[PDB]
Design a protein around this ligand. Structure first.
Ligand code: HEM
Ligand code: CAM
Ligand code: K
Ligand code: K
Length: 405
């Protein structure tokens, strides 16, 4: 239902969009959000859904907002407000200048140098998974590849038992697309309860895994506390278990429905990296936000202290004012404009690991299973939230057309 419209919010700016169940979801999640960019929708609207909040609908405002951390603080980054207030992950819940000392350490565990160190293993897993699937001539992509491929890689980096994935993934999903069985606060606490004993164990017997590095690391010269390590490790876990998983599904669904695009990569493998970026734009999937630190007039709209504003990273690249024919996938698009990995001081620290996982996937899959389609009659269903995803993606193919490496 709709929260009563606050006195300061203009009546004509109301557009009741529900980020957890957009009305046009059946056409595809990106399409559902794109309705916010239809001809008569303002640059900044107010939805009375989920407690009521602002929504920047165009890249120009989304980028500005993300750059102005003074006015748009990440202290309360999630909608609804309850989730946003319980949200205390490091470094994501902090703004510069305090954010930096913590972001630096986090960059040390998932940055480019670590990704290069994971190249071999990422490659090996990708190939083992696809080869095992190749002869079967079918698969449930979300559970057969999208989830295990990137999640196992992350669990390897964090030195955590794979058998722990079911629980952690369940908790992460409740924070991004809650089924209603758990509030953000409850899911966060379970995530923290899980980490506490591990963090203590690794601060005693330091390992080389991401968790040991964080728990035994320093923050601009001084030792990090147990609580800080917990708040950071929990964030790393959430970031490594949802985004790449669902992005791969969006990309492969598209590829399964587009033979011509598959051929382009088949005949022109050098384009895979470029295709990666275009897909990252077209199937952008996250949308979190900021909270107003003080009353502030933004693009002619009076925003009040405390007001929450959703700044959909997903919307920038879909904005027709940033890319012509935005909904069209063009692997040759001259200037791929987007904010898929965020924008500002919080730019995705795992974007390098993500790009690597995406390119290796496209490369290794197309090489062994160049021809595949979506299971006949299958009605693909998307789900919306802080991170949007694909519920299921049944693929099929003729093993005869496949190739073993
Ligand atoms: C396609 C995949 C990915 C997408 C689209 C994505 C997107 C995002 C976005 C939009 C933000 C910033 C949100 C904000 O400003 O509040 C972000 C931050 C972050 N991401 Fe990702 N991400 C991806 C993969 C990864 C991976 C693999 C990791 C690894 C753990 C990761 C780690 C992080 C971290 C640590 C931050 C917080 C940075 C900070 O707060 O300064 N991300 N990501
Ligand atoms: C918006 C995000 C993708 C980013 C990493 C996990 C996530 C859900 C956060 O809370 C910060
Ligand atoms: K009003
Ligand atoms: K908070």
């Amino acid at each position: 239902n709709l929260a009563p419209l606050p006195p300061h919010v203009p009546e004509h700016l109301v557009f009741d969009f529900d980020m957890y169940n957009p009305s046009n979801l059946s056409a595809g999640v990106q399409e559902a959000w794109a309705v916010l960019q239809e001809s008569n929708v303002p640059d900044l609207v107010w939805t009375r859904c989920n407690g009521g909040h602002w929504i920047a609908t165009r890249g120009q405002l989304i980028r500005e907002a993300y750059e102005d951390y003074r006015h748009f603080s990440s202290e309360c980054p999630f909608i609804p407000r309850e989730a946003g207030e319980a949200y205390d992950f490091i470094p994501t819940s902090m703004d510069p200048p305090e954010q930096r000392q913590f972001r630096a350490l986090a960059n040390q565990v998932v940055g480019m140098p670590v990704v290069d160190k994971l190249e071999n293993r990422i490659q090996e897993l990708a190939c083992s998974l696809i080869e095992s699937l190749r002869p079967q001539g079918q698969c449930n992509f979300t559970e057969d590849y999208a989830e295990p491929f990137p999640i196992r890689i992350f669990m390897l980096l964090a030195g955590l038992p794979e058998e722990d994935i079911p629980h952690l993934k369940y908790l992460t999903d409740q924070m991004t697309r809650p089924d209603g069985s758990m509030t953000f606060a409850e899911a966060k606490e379970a995530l923290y309860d899980y980490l506490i004993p591990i963090i203590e164990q690794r601060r005693q017997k330091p390992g080389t895994d991401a968790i040991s590095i964080v728990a035994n690391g320093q923050v601009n010269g001084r030792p990090i506390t147990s609580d800080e390590a917990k708040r950071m490790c929990g964030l790393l876990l959430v970031g490594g278990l949802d985004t790449v998983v669902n992005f791969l599904s969006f990309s492969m669904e598209f590829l399964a429905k587009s033979p011509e695009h598959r051929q382009e990569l088949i005949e022109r493998p050098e384009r895979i990296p470029a295709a990666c970026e275009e897909l990252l734009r077209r199937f952008s999937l996250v949308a979190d936000g900021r909270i107003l630190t003080s009353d502030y007039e933004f693009h002619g709209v009076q925003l009040k202290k405390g007001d929450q504003i959703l700044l959909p990273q997903m919307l920038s690249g879909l904005d027709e004012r940033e890319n012509a024919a935005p909904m069209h996938v063009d692997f040759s698009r001259q200037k791929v404009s987007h904010t898929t990995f965020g924008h500002g001081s919080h730019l995705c620290l795992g974007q390098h690991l993500a790009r690597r996982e995406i390119i290796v996937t496209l490369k290794e899959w197309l090489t062994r299973i160049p021809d595949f389609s979506i299971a006949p009659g299958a009605q693909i269903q998307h789900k919306s939230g802080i991170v949007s995803g694909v519920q299921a993606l049944p693929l099929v193919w003729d093993p005869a057309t496949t190739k073993a490496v």
